[model samples]
Target: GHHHHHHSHMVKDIIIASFYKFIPLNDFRSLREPILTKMHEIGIKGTIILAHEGVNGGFAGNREQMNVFYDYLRSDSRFADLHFKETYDNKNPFDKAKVKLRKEIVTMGVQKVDPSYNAGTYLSPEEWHQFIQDPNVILLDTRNDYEYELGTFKNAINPDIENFREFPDYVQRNLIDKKDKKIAMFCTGGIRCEKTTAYMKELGFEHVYQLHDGILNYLESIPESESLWEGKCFVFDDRVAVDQKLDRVYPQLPQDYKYEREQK
Candidate 1:
């Protein structure tokens, strides 16, 4: 007899956090034990990447566990004020839980950048529209060219970067002499600018700014017709992307799901 397998259930609550608090904690990696243990014990799965700067990730669990996990972080005064974006995942988007330590959390390729000490101004989603229309502002999309192709704000410049490490070189080649110009940067989530702004400061660029929570917040808060975003925003999960309302749109099918959805 052939083996039977259950269609895995979805992780009910998807919570996303992309923040850099700037202060380095010794033995940051030591916190991994409790996090991994707590998550799996309560049926949670997702990937969280940490660095000396901060954390950037999306994780999900059932409501009870999710709330408990959120509270666990909130109990720490350092993370007490953190906010997470939430959504549902009916499909099993992630199959495992992973906690990783990286050299540069978001990879701006500069060693001296620490957002806690020196960084750019943060423009909230409410303030972003005004900046978008400003005549003197120079806008940069802090993601790669492929992400840009999926969607981005109007008039935003794409660095065409193949990797996050390539970003510094691209900017220096293009904008080093324009230090006096007002510069604004944004990415999928707000994490990129958390490290990027400090580099710009080190480069002597003045008045650098970032979208407070990145384009994801912008699309979810602003109406579609009024949105400067032209297409779906590509995301790093099975859902593929999200729309202005942050609803998962372009759902990517797995190898088996591909067949089930095929010709009748």
Candidate 2:
């Protein structure tokens, strides 16, 4: 079936990305309202999950409109360094825009494990290239089975779990023998790794690390010739996922032109 409402009609090449990190914030509702308003005005669409811990979500919009929203987000001193692992493309993938508050940015069901606390070591794209080569390290994909199946690092291991909440249990039952192993975890964005590493440490596993901002950051920062990723990265959005180019994996996955509602 064809999409009833095309994502774009005049605006094109929307940037898509997922970003999340723990920051001390009081109210998620008030903080993101204006940003949402600005995005609607500029023809931006997608969803953002807000929480006291931080903000996490996927978004799509033209560069012009997106830039304004970015500026607005960065205007706040607290989010001054708001980082986005973005892919600018000609087509808008998501057909809708939604922003809502969640109890946890990425729910693990393990409470009081503060993300701002000892989560994990973050390796920049540059440093990650070298670190991943260490045979002694166990490269772990912190995403679900389907996400890992889509694409991941060269030697990454899929925990074979279904949900984020099951990650801790998987490690306990399968990784007890490798407790001392230097574990390197990553996800589409950095939220999963951050939480996973925190949980790993809470469970008394040391030598835990995660890709600084996940594969998206690595793909965006490191050239394909020098990268170790194997396939497209799965994301939670209308487009399904993205490749190393940050472009949609499938040619017809998204609507290309700026769409318009027909006259009656």
Candidate 3:
């Protein structure tokens, strides 16, 4: 028989946090220098993207350092209400800290699609459990194929797109006729689906819903025994995936994998 071994369960050393907010910021570029300098000064590492639409970021660092960073962001009245989803890892996820400016935090390649103005209804983790079981409601996974390869909700439909830009075409082909149906969509940290709901509703679909705070929040809030999540949830970090307990399950690529953005 082949031998098997499990890696040492060393104490989780890094605090990984994902946060985002969709709000109008006419001078988003002005936020870059201060944020990047703050992260560098505090020895935190990861990426924060700013856009006219809003801000989104994933960072890893000492708990106390990250708290300071969070406090700094909140001190700015513009980000006073930002929410963060925290998880743990045994190693640092990034080699450097970055604050990049972009046209949109999560690009969908569609013009004038704004979640801050128009978006889907937010269902709490508890309410989501009941919603997905409804025969009339369609469960849709908004992440890419690579992310879906890790896991997804029970009976969730995979759009099978290679990138976010292709999502509109997929919707036009498959969902155009089902505009009147109740649809629930979700993504890793809620950003994708948040923007997606805006586009879908703009296209005249009714009854659109999204998982509040995204899958991470659901995993953190719901008991694993009661969870409908089928497998590990792929994350954008050195720790590739996490389970319902928010524990790192895969620390590297599951296969010969590369992110679509990384390839670009």
Candidate 4:
């Protein structure tokens, strides 16, 4: 997955740190300058989103350098308890750092619904396994249509949604009737699940649960042994995909895949 064919410049390591927060919108905007300054000073490269509800992002750097960056965030009382999902690879997934301002970290088009609003409880991997085995449980994929097509849990329902903003409509139309069922929702990272769970709870879903840290965390806990999940989980990077075992999949990406847009 190295960008250049020659291995003269090997990546020391690859790291993915993903997390979400439920805080006031202004708090994020206010901290942007300081955060950006620190990131620049540390020579870290990645993306960060500042939203009213929360923040979500992934970054890559050398092992020691990334650890320093992680330590900085953890030492800050604001993000001390931040739950990060870590993954390693030989290739640096991103070519450069990017930070953006958005209406929502993962847009779901519902301005009225705050992600901090009554969110669903989280289910650890073991808890999720038990819930999935229950006869009354329904699993929903909170990711985009293409991600679902690439891989998902058994019986997992993809919203067929083009954008995260459009997810609520799919839920109302398809899963409303199944309100009595225990709904287990998930995404590649936990951000989407956080927002989606809030929305689902607002829509009268009595029993809602999210897979803690999403699929990546699940793969970290279990090996590839006839698991409910299948195929490599698509990621927002040059690597294209990562398998259920949390291993990077190096199959030549299909020409039609949107990830080619990044290369172009």
Candidate 5:
């Protein structure tokens, strides 16, 4: 696959959607071939994670082509009304399109609970900021330990767990005492937080809330502000991470962050 720089052409758009639902465990493998085939037919490119719990993924294509793909998804009764977050950039974010069968979509490493069970409430960026200013609210980072270290909301609790599957245990051990606290959770996009919120609600947290569309959406609504989130949020693409303003900052990954080939 050749990487093309279409700067003058506006390099298409990146469309992202993160949502959860219960798919019959039996249907997992049955749906793979057709979905993959259709995606390629449409020239769609990105990753899709299909699991017993549900699906979480995002792909990029031209505005019109992507809409056609989205229409195909919605035409299926199962994926109707899927909540998507839209972001645009002047470059192709993915090298190719891929669909994979996974045991879990976000991979928190936990296997006992079903993702469809007891999901928590969702809070949009405006609501999230209100809670951020509320002294009584406890913001939690549902992402991995390293992601939190890079950037997170002020006063947000980093479970310090190595994987998303370990999050349930970490929250149980650390947040049990803060049961009465107003809790707001977030992740890179919003998929992980959605699952985490469901798990928390199952554990009896009544006031749990997630940043709608996660940090990326928050950045779009609030931009850079002292009252907004704390640091750059990590992204899976070559961009590496996006700041509170949602700007590309991959070159800034490490004062020491470098690609070996680039070095040579």
Candidate 6:
């Protein structure tokens, strides 16, 4: 068979990196402008949230640009050990760069929920699979309703709240009884559970655990054939979600040059 000649454009490298740290941030508002200036100078684009608790952000750009930004962040002695979960894409993942100041990086809206002091035990993907196998272990999805609609792990319970702030009330009304039981919670990038596990411990939950680095890490590490996740994992970026294979699905690119995920 003869083939018709056709031209094609090669996709360039786009690196999307997400990371967070839960160290106390003093004068976080003062950190925003400097960060924004750095982004503009380096041609990086994405949303970074600075809160009194810590920093949470997802950034996308070329490898060189991404490296520069990451280097700049690490220059601040605080983020030296920051771990970035990198995912590749062919699309220009973000349009503009921004640094916003907020009260809680992953707003549970409660006071003194100190993740650094009271967070849950960390479970690796393999350990998570084993932990959930125990009949008495309760697996909780710590994301919102729309996020839950997309996909989740097997037998994970959805709290059915509209936002993170409502999670406290939901727990008080429903999960208070299970304080003594083994409960494992997870979110998109583990930030929510950082705060959630602490809050759960504050409520005297005896046995609490969280997926180390969250679902993104799970899908990235666990092979598809052995995977338990179903449906697309919603993300806060130009790409709306990522499938089990970690490919972007249903990308929502806004017309303007702007882009933005994760709880505290």
Clash pairs, candidate 6, are 106-264
lDDT of 2 at 229: 93
Residues 15-125 of candidate 5 have per-residue lDDT tens digits of: 534334556545877767777787898887777777766666767666666677788876767778666666655565667778878877667665565555433478888
Computed on alpha carbons, the lDDT of every model, listed in order, comes to 0.69, 0.74, 0.83, 0.72, 0.69, 0.82
lDDT of 4 by residue, 1-264 (tens): 323344324352566666667665566677677666767876767677767666667777765656677787667576777776777777677666666666777777787775565433898887787778765677888887778888988888777887777787888778889776788988887778887788778788888889988888787876568467777788876667887756677675663455411111
The window of 10 residues in a row where model 3 has the poorest summed lDDT is 255-264
Q: lDDT for model 3, please.
A: 0.83
For residues 155-236, could you state the per-residue lDDT of candidate 6 as single tens digits? 8899998778888898899889998899988888888888888888878888999999999989988889888788888788
TM-score of each: 0.84, 0.84, 0.90, 0.85, 0.81, 0.89
Tell how far residue 231 is off in model 6, in angstroms: 0.9
Point out the higher-scoring one by TM-score: 1 or 3.
3
Q: Give the worst 10-residue stretch by lDDT in candidate 5.
A: 255-264
Model 1 lDDT tens row, 36-135: 7777776667766666666556777555556777787667676676676776655545667777777755666677776764433888887888887776
Off by over 4 Å in 2: 1-12, 252-264
Residue 223 lDDT in candidate 4: 54
RMSD per model, one decimal = 7.2, 7.3, 6.6, 5.0, 5.4, 6.0
Error in Å for residue 248 of model 1: 1.1
Candidate 4, poorest ten consecutive residues by summed lDDT: 255-264
The global Cα lDDT (0 to 1) of model 5 is 0.69
Alpha-carbon shift of residue 108 in model 4 (angstroms): 0.9
On TM-score, the leading prediction is 3
Which is superior by lDDT, 1 or 2? 2
Give the lDDT of residue 149 in candidate 4: 89
| Weakest 10 consecutive residues of candidate 2 by summed lDDT | 255-264
